[PDB]
């Protein structure tokens, strides 16, 4: 997917304009809240849903992670 995206963003109609690259404010906002924060939120979600139950002997996987809440109170 990333290789395809790299090819795609070299097409004339998809190549981002120069002003887009130098949009410092939006880049910082997204790469802080999105790339760092949401990513960390997703990782802690993984730890709560998968890592911790797996460490406590409970098998959580894609086939059963939607019906077994990580905490009994939920």
């Amino acid at each position: 997917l990333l290789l395809f995206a790299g090819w795609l963003h070299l097409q004339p109609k998809f190549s981002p304009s120069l002003s887009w690259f130098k949009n410092n404010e939006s880049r910082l906002n997204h790469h802080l809240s999105g790339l760092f924060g949401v990513s960390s939120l997703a990782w802690t979600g993984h730890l709560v849903h998968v890592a911790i139950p797996e460490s406590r002997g409970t098998h959580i996987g894609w086939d059963n992670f939607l019906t077994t809440p990580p905490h009994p109170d939920g």
Binding site: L3, F4, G6, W7, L10
Partner: peptide
């Protein structure tokens, strides 16, 4: 314990990715 089918489909997806890499590089356009 990965079966031969799993290895084969991994190889197929790797071949697709390799072709995409070929095209991306070609498009970087030296």
């Amino acid at each position: 314990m990965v079966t031969d089918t799993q290895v084969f489909i991994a190889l197929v997806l790797a071949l697709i990715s390799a072709l995409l890499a070929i095209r991306l590089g070609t498009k970087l356009y030296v």
